[PDB]
Amino acid sequence: LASFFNSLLSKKT
Amino acid sequence: LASFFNSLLSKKT
Amino acid sequence: TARLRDQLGTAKNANEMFRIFSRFNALFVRPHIRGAIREYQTQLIQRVKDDIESLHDKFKVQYPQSQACKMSHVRDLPPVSGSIIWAKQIDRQLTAYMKRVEDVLGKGWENHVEGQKLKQDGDSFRMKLNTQEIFDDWARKVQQRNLGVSGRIFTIKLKVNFLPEIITLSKEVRNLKWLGFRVPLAIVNKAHQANQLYPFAISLIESVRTYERTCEKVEERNTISLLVAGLKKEVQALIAEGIALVWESYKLDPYVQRLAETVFNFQE
Amino acid sequence: KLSLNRQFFDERWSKHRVVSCLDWSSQYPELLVASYNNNEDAPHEPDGVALVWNMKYKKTTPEYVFHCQSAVMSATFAKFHPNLVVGGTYSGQIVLWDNRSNKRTPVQRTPLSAAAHTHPVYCVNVVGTQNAHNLISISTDGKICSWSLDMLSHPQDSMELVHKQSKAVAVTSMSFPVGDVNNFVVGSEEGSVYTACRHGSKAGISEMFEGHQGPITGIHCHAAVGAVDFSHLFVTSSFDWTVKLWSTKNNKPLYSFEDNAGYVYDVMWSPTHPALFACVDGMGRLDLWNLNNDTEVPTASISVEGNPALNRVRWTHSGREIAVGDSEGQIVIYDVGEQIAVPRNDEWARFGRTLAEINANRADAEEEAAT
Amino acid sequence: SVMSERVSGLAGSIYREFERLIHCYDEEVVKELMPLVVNVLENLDSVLSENQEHEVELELLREDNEQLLTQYEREKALRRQAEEKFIEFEDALEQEKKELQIQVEH
Amino acid sequence: VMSERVSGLAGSIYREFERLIHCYDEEVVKELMPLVVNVLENLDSVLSENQEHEVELELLREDNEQLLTQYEREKALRRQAEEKFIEFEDALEQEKKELQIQVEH
């Protein structure tokens, strides 16, 4: 469940 | 629980 | 019993015999009265089985191939809600026929010789007649679609930032709430947002289409351009006033008719 | 007996369209208007299109053709102006057509403002008298506006029909009792008949009428006038495969008619015979119900060839003919026999004994269910 | 820990709002709010998973109560049926052995 | 009543909401209010339902254990009564037929 928005974040890094 | 975030918002608008 | 054995001499059709069998149902708790009526029960079971098979052939075709989908679409029913309605009325007819066979066979009808197959097939048919999965799939695709209403009231050529197909979602929300489904609250609030802005958006898109249809006429006939430029700049000022407005604004409510009557005046 | 009289179809206009409303002019009893949905095959063709047909002539061509750019699904004549045809469309315009004008474009239309209807309009009607009458239209969102028939750019009165902490109802049908202008009944998509008042201190929806589990598709108040009054009765049709008879003095349905094996679309009373009405289904079977004869079996039922879905049904003012409208677009007209259409002298008295018996049977059934 | 459809739906709406707020202003909106949201989101799934265990335990132990009550009642009744047949057999065959005793005494 | 873990996580998102409101503008959370009060109300209501289920669970488990014990004791009494019955049966019939062979002598 934590993976979803972590991916949300790492899009531009 | 509505009232509290409601205050959050109107407290300075 | 002799007062009940004149049934064929009174009832000429199975429907009034159904009705008089339903009216006099409580006399059949007595075992002698239950044993007295046996040649009627077999015919009644065969008629109910024929009706159940006929409704099975009604459900043999699907909702897209049915004429009911066409007749619901011509009566402004959204197709998801029309499918839900159609399956629920099929289930209601099945429950009515189960009530009929319970009335005809008396109590303990589920354990009877003929009632066992009827009850088992009714259970297996009602398992296939539920509407939860189609509702869940509709909810998932609505929660995937994201028909938003937020933004400025214009988009650039002149057009209004409003898809007109969002009013279908409001129809499905106001229909599925009637059918006992608990839709999520964000979808209900989006339907409220659509239903509030829909007449104003319709008047906006109609005034914009009127303005461009007369602007084509103005730019086609250039000889009278001096006469009609008095209010062309006026409605351009109205448009530029509405450029700063967004859909969340509460100032659109005077603004829509304040655009509309000027558009009508410029048309006239 | 039930027999075929005439068949109406136009290849250019009526092809691949569903009939949506039927009416017969009171001044010209040989005329019939019609209303059609859009043609999905030809977007270049007009979406809404209205046709006027005739009885006296033998000509298969329609007498007048009217059309509109949006799909019209509610059409009627004007009661006190013979030259006018009122239509209600998908977009919410209430267009007005004139036969004396040579243009098939609508000569007048209401604005698409929030003051007027923006949701589709399925009911349009004219009530009032010769020297005082308005045009009444209710849209699907529950908005009902009154229009003067000479000036159409602004509604006269407007309010929204609400109930249950002001939730908007979804008006799908409409009827008016004979001799009444202020009180009327509506159907609903929410499956419940309401009573409404036009103007007053309780102007708006008055009462629940409960008992339909499906969307109500057609209602009609009683119209036949004789020795004993019957104007408080009306019959509704719905998607629940039932036709239900109601009265305004009862919160519950009087009797449910369950002869069908499909959706039921319209029902309306005979204007002459007091205990006679007709209903249509999704299998083309126009049924006739005589309440003084039997309460569970249609008196005369015939099927349309090819079996399409019959949308609308509408009697004539004479009551000797009856017009149906199918799902492909052919207005099929039947003429009923003299043994069914003609009311006898005791028919009002026989129905005066009939309704009471029906109510008694209903009470018996309900007590049985309770126990 | 299987996620339900309802928690996935409202987390999808949270994902929608978070993408909208990321696109609208900057990255720095989400960087402290999403760890304060995801633990509540885990807590919703945890309390639903515990609640369904509570429901199935309630149903099985309830039906075991109604099994126990009627089984004990039937067993008490069939103990009573043992306890008067004893008495009837006892006094009947005691009277017969007493009449046998006095007839063999004389 | 508001539960304390929901109140603490509520305070966490309250100070976060104050940070985002003071940091940029007032439209940061205008689309975030009826989502987050729904999520917090969901957690509170399901936790309250869990709280009801726990106490009714402990009541029915307790009298379940009591009913199991008393039914086991009833089993013991029933089996003992049947054994005493069949023993008294055999013994009395035994000396009765010893009496009738004494009669036949």
PDB file of N, CA and C in Angstrom, chain E residues 59-91:
ATOM      1  N   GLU E  59     -20.907 -15.535  14.502  1.00  0.00           N
ATOM      2  CA  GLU E  59     -21.895 -16.432  13.897  1.00  0.00           C
ATOM      3  C   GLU E  59     -21.698 -17.877  14.346  1.00  0.00           C
ATOM      4  N   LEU E  60     -20.445 -18.362  14.331  1.00  0.00           N
ATOM      5  CA  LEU E  60     -20.211 -19.757  14.704  1.00  0.00           C
ATOM      6  C   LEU E  60     -20.507 -19.998  16.184  1.00  0.00           C
ATOM      7  N   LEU E  61     -20.119 -19.064  17.052  1.00  0.00           N
ATOM      8  CA  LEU E  61     -20.359 -19.300  18.464  1.00  0.00           C
ATOM      9  C   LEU E  61     -21.824 -19.086  18.824  1.00  0.00           C
ATOM     10  N   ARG E  62     -22.533 -18.203  18.104  1.00  0.00           N
ATOM     11  CA  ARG E  62     -23.970 -18.055  18.312  1.00  0.00           C
ATOM     12  C   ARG E  62     -24.703 -19.347  17.973  1.00  0.00           C
ATOM     13  N   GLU E  63     -24.423 -19.915  16.791  1.00  0.00           N
ATOM     14  CA  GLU E  63     -25.105 -21.146  16.395  1.00  0.00           C
ATOM     15  C   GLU E  63     -24.728 -22.305  17.311  1.00  0.00           C
ATOM     16  N   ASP E  64     -23.531 -22.249  17.901  1.00  0.00           N
ATOM     17  CA  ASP E  64     -23.175 -23.258  18.890  1.00  0.00           C
ATOM     18  C   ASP E  64     -23.956 -23.067  20.197  1.00  0.00           C
ATOM     19  N   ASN E  65     -24.310 -21.815  20.545  1.00  0.00           N
ATOM     20  CA  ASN E  65     -25.231 -21.592  21.672  1.00  0.00           C
ATOM     21  C   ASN E  65     -26.596 -22.229  21.429  1.00  0.00           C
ATOM     22  N   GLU E  66     -27.196 -21.976  20.255  1.00  0.00           N
ATOM     23  CA  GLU E  66     -28.508 -22.591  20.019  1.00  0.00           C
ATOM     24  C   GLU E  66     -28.406 -24.096  19.817  1.00  0.00           C
ATOM     25  N   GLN E  67     -27.220 -24.611  19.514  1.00  0.00           N
ATOM     26  CA  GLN E  67     -27.102 -26.062  19.489  1.00  0.00           C
ATOM     27  C   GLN E  67     -27.136 -26.593  20.919  1.00  0.00           C
ATOM     28  N   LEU E  68     -26.356 -25.956  21.803  1.00  0.00           N
ATOM     29  CA  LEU E  68     -26.202 -26.384  23.191  1.00  0.00           C
ATOM     30  C   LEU E  68     -27.500 -26.371  23.970  1.00  0.00           C
ATOM     31  N   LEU E  69     -28.292 -25.316  23.783  1.00  0.00           N
ATOM     32  CA  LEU E  69     -29.524 -25.147  24.547  1.00  0.00           C
ATOM     33  C   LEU E  69     -30.528 -26.267  24.288  1.00  0.00           C
ATOM     34  N   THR E  70     -30.818 -26.530  23.016  1.00  0.00           N
ATOM     35  CA  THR E  70     -31.766 -27.579  22.671  1.00  0.00           C
ATOM     36  C   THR E  70     -31.212 -28.968  22.939  1.00  0.00           C
ATOM     37  N   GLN E  71     -29.894 -29.158  22.797  1.00  0.00           N
ATOM     38  CA  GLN E  71     -29.332 -30.465  23.119  1.00  0.00           C
ATOM     39  C   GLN E  71     -29.445 -30.768  24.608  1.00  0.00           C
ATOM     40  N   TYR E  72     -29.184 -29.768  25.455  1.00  0.00           N
ATOM     41  CA  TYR E  72     -29.350 -29.939  26.894  1.00  0.00           C
ATOM     42  C   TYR E  72     -30.809 -30.164  27.264  1.00  0.00           C
ATOM     43  N   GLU E  73     -31.728 -29.456  26.601  1.00  0.00           N
ATOM     44  CA  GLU E  73     -33.149 -29.628  26.892  1.00  0.00           C
ATOM     45  C   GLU E  73     -33.633 -31.029  26.526  1.00  0.00           C
ATOM     46  N   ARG E  74     -33.216 -31.526  25.356  1.00  0.00           N
ATOM     47  CA  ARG E  74     -33.558 -32.883  24.939  1.00  0.00           C
ATOM     48  C   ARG E  74     -32.964 -33.916  25.887  1.00  0.00           C
ATOM     49  N   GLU E  75     -31.735 -33.677  26.341  1.00  0.00           N
ATOM     50  CA  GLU E  75     -31.075 -34.606  27.245  1.00  0.00           C
ATOM     51  C   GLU E  75     -31.722 -34.631  28.626  1.00  0.00           C
ATOM     52  N   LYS E  76     -32.168 -33.471  29.118  1.00  0.00           N
ATOM     53  CA  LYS E  76     -32.921 -33.415  30.368  1.00  0.00           C
ATOM     54  C   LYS E  76     -34.238 -34.172  30.249  1.00  0.00           C
ATOM     55  N   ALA E  77     -34.937 -33.992  29.121  1.00  0.00           N
ATOM     56  CA  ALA E  77     -36.199 -34.696  28.899  1.00  0.00           C
ATOM     57  C   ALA E  77     -36.010 -36.207  28.845  1.00  0.00           C
ATOM     58  N   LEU E  78     -34.939 -36.672  28.210  1.00  0.00           N
ATOM     59  CA  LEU E  78     -34.736 -38.108  28.144  1.00  0.00           C
ATOM     60  C   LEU E  78     -34.146 -38.668  29.433  1.00  0.00           C
ATOM     61  N   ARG E  79     -33.595 -37.818  30.305  1.00  0.00           N
ATOM     62  CA  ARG E  79     -33.311 -38.262  31.667  1.00  0.00           C
ATOM     63  C   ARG E  79     -34.592 -38.429  32.474  1.00  0.00           C
ATOM     64  N   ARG E  80     -35.556 -37.520  32.287  1.00  0.00           N
ATOM     65  CA  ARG E  80     -36.852 -37.657  32.951  1.00  0.00           C
ATOM     66  C   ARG E  80     -37.559 -38.932  32.512  1.00  0.00           C
ATOM     67  N   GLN E  81     -37.508 -39.229  31.210  1.00  0.00           N
ATOM     68  CA  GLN E  81     -38.093 -40.465  30.700  1.00  0.00           C
ATOM     69  C   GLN E  81     -37.413 -41.709  31.251  1.00  0.00           C
ATOM     70  N   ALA E  82     -36.141 -41.619  31.623  1.00  0.00           N
ATOM     71  CA  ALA E  82     -35.542 -42.686  32.407  1.00  0.00           C
ATOM     72  C   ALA E  82     -36.030 -42.688  33.848  1.00  0.00           C
ATOM     73  N   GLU E  83     -36.416 -41.529  34.382  1.00  0.00           N
ATOM     74  CA  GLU E  83     -36.690 -41.422  35.811  1.00  0.00           C
ATOM     75  C   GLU E  83     -38.136 -41.675  36.230  1.00  0.00           C
ATOM     76  N   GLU E  84     -39.109 -41.727  35.316  1.00  0.00           N
ATOM     77  CA  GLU E  84     -40.384 -42.327  35.740  1.00  0.00           C
ATOM     78  C   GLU E  84     -40.588 -43.771  35.304  1.00  0.00           C
ATOM     79  N   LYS E  85     -39.893 -44.238  34.266  1.00  0.00           N
ATOM     80  CA  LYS E  85     -39.980 -45.648  33.900  1.00  0.00           C
ATOM     81  C   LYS E  85     -39.360 -46.528  34.982  1.00  0.00           C
ATOM     82  N   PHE E  86     -38.284 -46.033  35.614  1.00  0.00           N
ATOM     83  CA  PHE E  86     -37.732 -46.634  36.829  1.00  0.00           C
ATOM     84  C   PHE E  86     -38.801 -46.800  37.901  1.00  0.00           C
ATOM     85  N   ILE E  87     -39.562 -45.739  38.180  1.00  0.00           N
ATOM     86  CA  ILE E  87     -40.544 -45.777  39.260  1.00  0.00           C
ATOM     87  C   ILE E  87     -41.676 -46.746  38.948  1.00  0.00           C
ATOM     88  N   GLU E  88     -42.200 -46.704  37.718  1.00  0.00           N
ATOM     89  CA  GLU E  88     -43.303 -47.578  37.324  1.00  0.00           C
ATOM     90  C   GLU E  88     -42.893 -49.048  37.339  1.00  0.00           C
ATOM     91  N   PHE E  89     -41.712 -49.351  36.782  1.00  0.00           N
ATOM     92  CA  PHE E  89     -41.190 -50.712  36.812  1.00  0.00           C
ATOM     93  C   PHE E  89     -40.953 -51.165  38.244  1.00  0.00           C
ATOM     94  N   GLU E  90     -40.426 -50.255  39.073  1.00  0.00           N
ATOM     95  CA  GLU E  90     -40.076 -50.567  40.450  1.00  0.00           C
ATOM     96  C   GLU E  90     -41.294 -50.967  41.261  1.00  0.00           C
ATOM     97  N   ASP E  91     -42.337 -50.131  41.277  1.00  0.00           N
ATOM     98  CA  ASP E  91     -43.440 -50.447  42.183  1.00  0.00           C
ATOM     99  C   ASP E  91     -44.306 -51.567  41.616  1.00  0.00           C
TER     100      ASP E  91
END
